[PDB]
Design a protein around this ligand. Structure first.
Ligand SMILES: CC(C)=CCC/C(C)=C/CC/C(C)=C/CC/C(C)=C/CC/C(C)=C/CC/C(C)=C\CC/C(C)=C\CC/C(C)=C/CC/C(C)=C/COP(=O)(O)O[C@@H]1OC[C@H](N)[C@H](O)[C@H]1O
Ligand SMILES: Nc1ncnc2c1ncn2[C@@H]1O[C@H](COP(=O)(O)OP(=O)(O)OP(=O)(O)O)[C@@H](O)[C@H]1O
Ligand SMILES: Nc1ncnc2c1ncn2[C@@H]1O[C@H](COP(=O)(O)OP(=O)(O)OP(=O)(O)O)[C@@H](O)[C@H]1O
Lengths: 245, 645, 245
């Protein structure tokens, strides 16, 4: 196993009102598993991803990733670990307004030793893999509303991550582009061992997955397994379970 | 019910509204102080004249222009900061006219409140600076600053005329916008060329040429073709306009060229050491091409005024020491005997030295590098003073050699001395030639024996053995003696001076402290006005440097919470801002130092008699203060970064 | 009829690098209609909404609204039209960060002559049958990604508009909230006669409409008129047409 969670707890407050968004979530994600989380529209999902990674803090609970535990971990080794792995795809389209598309894509690759020609060739391959080409010299103001999503998605596939955290990858894309992105994610999971965690609302996107987790009011409610089944039967099961909820 | 909404928005957007009233406060606090200095009965003596009145005619327009430009820039930033409520209101259903009226009413309220507040701020600063100058510098000016009544009218008329320009700018900004461009103007780039654009190099070249021609015209201001009071004003206006226009054209056309040639030569890889240092200045180059100009101008003015004040003070002290050539000087021997006998029971020892002087005339026309137009006496008949070699404990000249003494820096501007040559000594019935060796660094006789001011000469004792024997009695004084009194390290020198005053009933003997006091008192207004203006401009420079720091720190806060998310440590973001701080604090300082150096050098020899000693000493302290301010700025950015996430 | 366009053309550029995003678009909406536009991801949809309204200027062509033309129209009557009609939803969720939910929704009511009670009652009703009612003292920066969408959509019905322009309303909502929003829009379409224009990528959401227009590279491409058919048959027809394209 890679990610281990045990009685997690989160609370947003200002010392006067302490509202609860997560109450006892337990997950046991294993290596090379395409786990997906979905359900509701007001419960804690992006907060669950934030606390699951190191981008935020926790109130009560322990999380284990690759053996070691984040209890006494400082803000230096944590940042180094977040830099070396854990590619991210945010929801609010976290781009930089003072840079270009190419610079935004190539920035995380510029840490250790990479050379100009290799970086250029890699960006070329990734860019015409997704579809954001001829937009290598345009600021993220003159660009459309879905090409920003494609750029943010492509930023996290360039530095060879070990874990990928997704947050509604198919939010502003049609059927074809969403299918292409999901197929690329599945290929990356299959050919090379790299766990992918994706949160989405459309059942079609969750059909490509291997497991689906339903969350309701910060609790574990039902858990499918797919397994030796075809895509159509799994999709019908997802639709029926969503209709029940 | 718009008013409740606007107040509700104000209750949360308090940071932007606190960076506008601050500028509106200290601009008035500066202008009113300058005006109340200008209107003062004690300055009428400095008024009229020929050169004195021309300065007031140009300062009165320079300060107005500077204040107007700064206020207009601050207002433009204030309007562009929001630029979102305007678009939302336009979408809701308001016409442009209603928005203009609402903005104008709010601006009237804020601006007049700030004008009322600011006047009470300038008065306190003026009185505090006056207290400093009269207390911890110890000068005599006998001048006082009163509240007066013309100053208020002078302030109010100008600051009510500025409101028309502000309203025109706001109205034209509202008119020349679309309902969609307002939404994305807060995060839109200003570098609109994105090319090499060799035209910017031409603009920079014109800026440099204008600065150089301004310098050259300033080099030939006093002592030339300018005599009438309507001629100096025009030259001063031309110089002070050319320098500023040249600096502004130099900054705008040069950064946008060397900042494009760097990025275009990279292709775009941009590791995290340039994303925080080059991208930011490329984003905001056009709005920083006007603030840097103001910073350079105010810094140059402060440095120049302080340098001139220190030149006046140091030159007064040095000349007072120079005119006596010793701690105490005497004319006759008997009074010196009285003074020494009085000191004998005072338990204070004295170093009495006797040096005979032989006043004789020599020829130094050949060694002079000047022109016969500067007569300063007959070209072959300088009157000098001659002393032997044994009287000097520092040098021992050889036979057939002549050495001069004295430095008096101002003298090396009219009489210019060449290298070693030959000096002709003419006597009653003989002619002994001598050849020059060097110029010493000390004075050996008082001002009585130096005639017009030329120093003395030291010759070997062998030649003196017959020069004193000859002793042509045609230009000799009453007696040839330079009995002087020397004392030890710092002690009760005031007691000795009081004894000296009580000794000389006819006060026919020279003193050091009395001459120092007289020289300091004779230049009181001249050394007070420049000090006052320099201190006020220094305070304004500090405030304007502090304002930009908070403005730029708040402008780009959201970018520190994205890079820190991807994984970059807080110890690596601080390594990319040091470059920006070094640039921002290294360009204006160097340009201001150059401006001050070419400004002081063309205006000395009216305030004192020494330049290279105090001018170097006054710039070092300013550089140290400026570096301290930069270090504090870096520390503040570190504190801001730590709390980004 | 209400809208009547004739050869709309739009160009983004600066007279040197000019692109083309619209080339000859003709729309003939009639009073009391529910039209939807869908297709592609880099084509012109948001620009189409911005140009059919009175926010962006047409490069070539004319558009007529309620008889009189609007491209060559004075400012006073145009502002009166904005105040007494229209109402627009932004994809970027254009909210004000220095206010909270209540004022940000009540902003259109700050110019009309209504008392302190009627406006509050109207806001309370809209929040009651919109879903977001407990979010009244929270600024739109500590709020989730779908509740912001609900706030933006709700700041369009509070002044009883006659033309509602929607731009991807169901993009960050689950099935239940999307169904609620669509049926509310349908109810406002039938009782109070008001034409509605909506652009979306989900076939399920677009099945509620009465007509769909497919746009490909800024050109017209087929038109399904629905007619006397059930919802399921219309959904199947839309899916087949999308699959063909
Ligand atoms: C006049 C006055 C009240 C104060 C002087 C200072 C002042 C506020 C002047 C107003 C004007 C101001 C504000 C000047 C700025 C100065 C500087 C340093 C700017 C740096 C920034 C900067 C942007 C510089 C770039 C420009 C360049 C390179 C050069 C410009 C050269 C310039 C124009 C002035 C500098 C030299 C001076 C100071 C001469 C003052 C002359 C003066 C009448 C002094 C009175 O001396 P005074 O002893 O009375 O003279 C006796 O008068 C009775 C007897 N009959 C004779 O006339 C006489 O021997
Ligand atoms: N400000 C701009 N300047 C220049 N070109 C622009 C600008 N904004 C958008 N474009 C380009 O013009 C076209 C208009 O894109 P548009 O926003 O209409 O796309 P869309 O398919 O409606 O968006 P989405 O599906 O992402 O919501 C795109 O090719 C886009 O890249
Ligand atoms: N910074 C915050 N401070 C306080 N409350 C918050 C903050 N962020 C979110 N909340 C609230 O806490 C809960 C957490 O919502 P969350 O962001 O996890 O939603 P979500 O699953 O991403 O929703 P969706 O995708 O439907 O918009 C919500 O009720 C939200 O209103």
């Amino acid at each position: 196993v890679i990610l281990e969670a045990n009685k997690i707890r989160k609370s947003y407050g200002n010392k006067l009102n302490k509202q609860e968004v997560l109450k006892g979530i337990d997950i046991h994600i294993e290596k090379g598993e395409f786990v997906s989380i979905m359900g509701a529209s007001g419960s804690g999902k992006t907060t669950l991803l934030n606390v699951l990674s190191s981008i935020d803090q926790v109130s009560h609970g322990t999380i284990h990733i690759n053996g070691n535990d984040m209890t006494a971990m400082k803000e230096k080794q944590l940042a180094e670990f977040r830099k070396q792995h854990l590619g991210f795809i945010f929801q609010d389209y976290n781009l930089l307004d003072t840079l270009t598309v190419k610079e935004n894509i190539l920035l995380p690759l510029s840490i250790t030793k990479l050379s100009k020609k290799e970086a250029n060739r890699k960006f070329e391959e990734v860019a015409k893999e997704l579809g954001i080409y001829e937009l290598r010299d345009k600021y993220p103001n003159e660009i459309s509303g879905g090409q920003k999503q494609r750029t943010s998605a492509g930023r996290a596939f360039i530095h060879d991550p070990s874990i990928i955290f997704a947050d509604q990858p198919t939010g502003a894309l049609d059927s074809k582009s969403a299918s292409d992105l999901l197929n690329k994610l599945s290929q990356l999971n299959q050919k090379r061992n790299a766990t992918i965690i994706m949160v989405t609302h459309d059942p079609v996107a969750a059909s490509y997955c291997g497991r689906v987790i339903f969350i309701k009011d910060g609790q574990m409610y039902t858990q499918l397994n797919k397994g030796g089944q075809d895509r159509q039967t799994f999709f019908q099961d997802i639709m029926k379970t969503q209709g029940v909820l | 019910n718009i008013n409740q909404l606007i107040l509700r928005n104000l209750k949360k957007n308090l940071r932007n509204y606190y960076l506008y009233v601050f500028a509106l406060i200290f601009s008035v606090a500066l202008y009113f102080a300058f005006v109340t200095l200008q209107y003062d009965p004690a300055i009428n003596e400095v008024k009229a004249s020929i050169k004195g009145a021309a300065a007031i005619k140009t300062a009165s327009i320079l300060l107005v222009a500077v204040v107007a430009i700064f206020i207009l820039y601050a207002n433009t930033i204030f309007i562009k900061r929001r630029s979102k409520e305007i678009g939302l209101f336009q979408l809701i259903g308001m016409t442009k006219h209603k928005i203009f009226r609402i903005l104008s009413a709010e601006n009237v309220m804020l601006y007049f409140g700030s004008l009322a507040i600011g006047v009470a701020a300038g008065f306190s600063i003026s009185k505090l600076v006056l207290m400093i100058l009269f207390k911890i510098v110890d000068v005599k000016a006998d001048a006082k600053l009163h509240f007066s009544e013309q100053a208020l009218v002078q302030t109010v008329i100008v600051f009510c005329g500025i409101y028309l320009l502000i309203m025109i700018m706001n109205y034209t900004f509202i008119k020349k916008q679309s309902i969609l461009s307002l939404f994305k103007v807060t995060s839109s780039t200003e570098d609109k060329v994105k090319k090499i654009s060799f035209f910017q190099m031409l603009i920079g070249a014109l800026g440099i040429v204008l600065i150089l021609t301004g310098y050259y015209v300033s080099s030939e201001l006093f002592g030339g073709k300018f005599k009438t009071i309507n001629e100096l004003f025009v030259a001063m206006s031309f110089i002070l306009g050319s320098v500023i226009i040249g600096t502004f054209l130099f900054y705008k056309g040069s950064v946008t060229f060397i900042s494009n040639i760097i990025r275009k030569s990279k292709g775009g890889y941009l590791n995290i050491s340039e994303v925080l240092s080059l991208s930011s200045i490329m984003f905001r180059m056009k709005s920083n091409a006007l603030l840097l100009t103001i910073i350079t101008t105010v810094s140059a003015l402060a440095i120049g005024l302080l340098s001139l004040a220190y030149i006046s003070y140091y030159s007064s002290e040095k000349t007072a020491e120079q005119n006596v050539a010793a701690d105490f000087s005497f004319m006759n021997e008997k009074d010196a005997k009285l003074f020494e006998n009085k000191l004998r029971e005072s338990n204070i020892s004295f170093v009495k030295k006797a040096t005979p002087v032989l006043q004789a005339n020599v020829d130094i026309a050949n060694i002079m590098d000047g022109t016969p137009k500067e007569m300063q006496g007959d070209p072959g008949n300088m009157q000098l003073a001659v002393v032997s070699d044994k009287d000097v404990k520092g040098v021992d000249v050889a036979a057939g050699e002549a050495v001069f003494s004295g430095y008096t820096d101002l003298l090396q501007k009219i009489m210019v001395f060449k290298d070693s040559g030959v000096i002709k000594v003419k006597s009653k019935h003989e002619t002994q030639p001598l050849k020059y060796k060097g110029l010493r660094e000390e004075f050996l006789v008082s001002y009585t024996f130096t005639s017009g001011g030329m120093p003395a000469v030291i010759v070997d004792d062998s030649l003196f053995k017959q020069l004193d024997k000859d002793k042509d009695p045609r230009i000799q004084l009453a007696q040839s003696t330079f009995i002087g009194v020397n004392v030890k390290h710092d002690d009760q020198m005031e007691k000795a001076n009081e004894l000296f005053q009580q000794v000389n009933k006819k006060n026919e003997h020279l003193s050091r402290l009395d001459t120092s006091a007289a020289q300091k008192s004779l230049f009181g207004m001249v050394m007070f006005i420049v000090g006052f203006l320099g201190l006020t401009f220094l305070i304004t420079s500090g405030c304007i440097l502090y304002f930009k720091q908070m403005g730029e720190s708040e402008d780009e806060k959201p970018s520190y919470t994205i890079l820190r998310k991807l994984g970059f440590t807080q110890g690596d973001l601080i390594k990319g801002i040091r470059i920006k701080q070094m640039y921002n604090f290294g360009i204006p300082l160097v340009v201001g130092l150059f401006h001050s150096y070419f400004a002081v050098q063309s205006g000395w020899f009216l305030f004192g008699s020494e330049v290279w000693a105090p001018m170097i000493m006054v710039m070092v302290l300013y550089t140290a203060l400026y570096s301290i301010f930069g270090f504090l700025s870096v520390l503040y950015y570190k504190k801001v970064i730590k709390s980004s996430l």
